[PDB]
Design a protein around this ligand. Sequence first.
Ligand SMILES: COc1ccc2nc(C)c(O[C@@H]3C[C@H]4C(=O)N[C@]5(C(=O)NS(=O)(=O)C6(C)CC6)C[C@H]5/C=C\CCCCC[C@H](NC(=O)OC(C)(C)C(F)(F)F)C(=O)N4C3)nc2c1
Ligand SMILES: [Zn+2]
Length: 199
Amino acid sequence: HMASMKKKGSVVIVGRINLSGDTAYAQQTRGEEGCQETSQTGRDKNQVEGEVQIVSTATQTFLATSINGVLWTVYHGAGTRTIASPKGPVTQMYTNVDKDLVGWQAPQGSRSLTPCTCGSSDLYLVTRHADVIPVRRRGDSRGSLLSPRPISYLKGSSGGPLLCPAGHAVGIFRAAVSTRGVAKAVAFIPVESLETTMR
Ligand SMILES: COc1ccc2nc(C)c(O[C@@H]3C[C@H]4C(=O)N[C@]5(C(=O)NS(=O)(=O)C6(C)CC6)C[C@H]5/C=C\CCCCC[C@H](NC(=O)OC(C)(C)C(F)(F)F)C(=O)N4C3)nc2c1
Ligand SMILES: [Zn+2]
């Protein structure tokens, strides 16, 4: 009934994939009790750093990637949720269920990836475990893993980047193409589609 209707919590940044040096590694910045509290209030005063965030709702954990001053992730992870920030929940500025895409203004302190204009097909997928997986681009929105992996390896990495050799953003990881549980290929949201959404 109306008086007891609940509100969904905010997406919460709970860590990051550190790409600042020679070694990629995952960092946790918020434990579970802080996350639950931050999801309810929408107030997250942690300092944000880096391009790839680890984010969580009460029921899911996935990634989010800053490109052109927007923190982007998948609709199938975030739905229409706000994201927590120092002064309270922040409403999405982009929502496109047909592209499986959402975005919020990039957090203060984050850094953004540059959209790739290289036109290269040798790509690199960054996972929530800070694995950097070589991927050969196979079409506008697909790439094959040079070494296939069980889907278990990729679960929770939606919203992460596919990068070119120079570290530019080529797309956002959306779905795994799996045969008998082995991911031979991935589908991604091309960065051109993000740039069209921004218009
Ligand atoms: C709710 O409104 C919407 C709107 C648009 C959507 N668009 C799509 C595409 C959609 O697909 C959903 C969601 C997505 C998904 O699991 N992603 C990943 C992830 O890690 N997620 S996640 O972080 O753990 C989390 C679950 C917390 C957030 C990267 C995946 C890692 C491992 C694969 C696990 C096995 C699932 C394989 C499946 N393969 C698949 O569908 O491949 C085809 C058929 C070729 C196509 F055609 F999809 F490309 C698959 O990958 N997925 C099914 N759901 C949507 C829902
Ligand atoms: Zn590039």
